[PDB]
From a paper:
To elucidate the role of inter-domain interface exposure in [name]-mediated membrane fusion, we first determined the crystal structure of the [name] mutant. Of note, to facilitate the crystallization of [name], a small flexible loop (residues 57-68) was removed ([name]–Δloop). Similar to other [name] proteins, [name]-Δloop-[name] consists of tightly packed TRX and α domains, connected by a flexible linker. Despite the marked functional effect conferred by the [name] mutation, the static high-resolution structure of the compact conformation reveals no significant differences between WT and [name]. Close inspection of the [name]-[name] crystal structure reveals two positively charged residues, which can potentially form a salt-bridge with D34. R37 is within a salt-bridge distance (3.7 Å), while K191 is not captured interacting with D34 in the static structure. In addition, the per-residue root mean square fluctuation (RMSF) values (representing its spatial fluctuation relative to its average position along the simulation) are similar at both pH values. These simulations reveal that a salt-bridge interaction forms between D34 and K191 over a substantial fraction of the simulation trajectories. Notably, while [name]-WT and [name] share a similar HDX profile at pH 7.5, the WT protein exhibits a much higher exchange at pH 5.5, indicating that the [name] mutation decreases the conformational heterogeneity of [name] in solution. Importantly, as expected, this mutant prevented the large [name]-mediated change in liposome diameter measured using DLS, as well as lipid- and liposome content mixing. Together, these data indicate that F34 is critical for the function of [name] as a fusogen.
Numbering used by the authors: 25 to 251
The structure:
């Protein structure tokens, strides 16, 4: 861990964190590992974020994630992988559903696309509200016999969170700005998940500005013009 330089996307200001979920993903991982590293916002354009370890460039985001978990190990660094297989697949279809929802221009399809995103969101809400086996044994579940854990896998942030949280945040900001869509408040688990993230510095200080995210989708998202 002698040399760790992280190159994330830069915002319109040229210095701030720009909208790039993959960037926030790796940023959060390094932060949660407690390792010494440097961040440099650069104009990556369409190029993905990357990092250099001891001068050697690392590429991909999934491959970079595997390297960091395999290199920064106990006892000096905490293992950040999720213990439950289900935690790594919750909400995987959300971003895809959201993108098709906000990229649509025909009003005749809006309703269906919206239900698509909502259903994807409810599945994620369901997992977060269903107590994990540990909580059931521990009797760590609420009076509603409902899960009250803070994140996907448990009460500690994991690689699954570093991957999902940035996309989920983007979905919330953009879908609201360009469709006036709100993640229903009845999805108590999902909202409790999001609020917990906003309380942790590792997500807050690695997060792009609401205006930055919105401006980023100004061309991507389309207005429901055609019937």
């Amino acid at each position: 861990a002698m040399g760790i330089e992280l190159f994330v996307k830069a915002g319109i200001d040229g210095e701030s964190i720009g909208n790039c979920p993959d960037s926030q993903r790796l940023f959060m991982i390094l932060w949660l590992k407690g390792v010494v590293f440097n961040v440099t916002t650069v104009d990556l354009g369409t190029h993905p974020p990357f990092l250099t370890f001891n001068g050697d460039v690392k590429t991909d985001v999934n491959k970079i994630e595997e390297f960091l978990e395999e290199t920064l190990t106990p006892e000096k660094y905490p293992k950040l992988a999720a213990k439950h297989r289900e935690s790594n697949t919750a909400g995987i279809d959300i971003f895809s559903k959201f993108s098709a929802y906000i990229k649509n221009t025909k009003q005749q399809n809006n309703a269906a696309l919206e239900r698509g995103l909502t259903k994807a969101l409810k599945k994620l809400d369901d997992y977060l509200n269903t107590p994990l086996p540990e909580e059931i044994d521990a009797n760590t579940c609420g009076e509603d016999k409902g899960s009250r854990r803070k994140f996907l896998d448990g009460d500690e942030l994991t690689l699954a969170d570093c991957n999902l949280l940035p996309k989920l945040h983007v979905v919330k900001i953009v879908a609201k700005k360009y469709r006036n869509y709100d993640i229903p408040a009845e999805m108590t688990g999902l909202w409790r998940y999001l609020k917990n993230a906003y309380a942790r510095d590792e997500f807050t200080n690695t997060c792009a500005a609401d205006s930055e995210i919105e401006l980023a989708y100004a061309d991507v998202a389309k207005r429901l013009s055609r019937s």
